[PDB]
Structures are given as structure tokens and as C-alpha cells.
């Protein structure tokens, strides 16, 4: 389904359970949708039954609605600082203003309105937005 991560699931299984509690450089994405780049070590010990099945489209979901969800079950979402509920940089692809998607890049003024909207988001801290592709990069402190 286009999902991927680094370390890859095959690499994560070659770690010990104590190594899996602090995995560095963790990155998970879905091709054609986006990517999450975690800012600090993450604890992946909740997912050992199957990294691929637990993570790819279950715990992490990139949806066709141009958004991303981490721990969709509220009861399972860890405290901030636990698991994957930690700071990250996110890129989402094909994000556009509006009643279909407005992707006419000759319309710079409307794109500018949309861009200021993104810049003003309080939870999703703006990094960049490219109208050519609708590529929105931002930072979050957690996934609450």
C-alpha cells in the first residue's frame, strides 16, 4: 500500500527489545502521501507482533483526504513523550485550497491566502508550502 519506514521492518526485527525502546532516526511514510521524521528516539516496543502490520496503515495512517493520523484509537494513544507520541516533522503531499481542490498555480493570490492559513496554524508549526505539488511541511510536538 506504499507504506515504508526506516529502519525498515526487517531491520527493526534485528534489534533487541531494549534497542527497540530507543530507536534513532525513525522515519515512516507512504509514497504519494507524505512522511513523518521523528525528532528524538522513539519506543517501538508496542509493535513487535509485526512492525509492518502494526505500523503500516494501522497505527500510522496517511489518508486520501491528505492528512495523517498516529494512534487512531484514543484509548491506546500513549502519554506525550511515550511511543510515537513525540516531536516530529511532517510533510503531506497534494494539499491544496478549495468545491474541488484548487490546483491552478497561475492563481497565486488564492494560493497566498491558503499559505497564510497554513502559516497561522497553532498546532502544526509551519515550515514550508509549495503550491507546485501542494507540499506542506510542518512540525508537531506530539500527536494529541
Swiss-Prot record:
Chain spans, region Nucleoporin RNA-binding motif (NRM): 2-142
Location in or out of the cell: Nucleus, Nuclear pore complex; Nucleus membrane
Domain of life: Eukaryota
Membrane disposition: Peripheral membrane protein
Domain Peptidase S59: 1-143
Annotated phenotype, changing residue 142 to P: Loss of autocatalytic cleavage
Name of the protein in question: Nucleoporin NUP145N
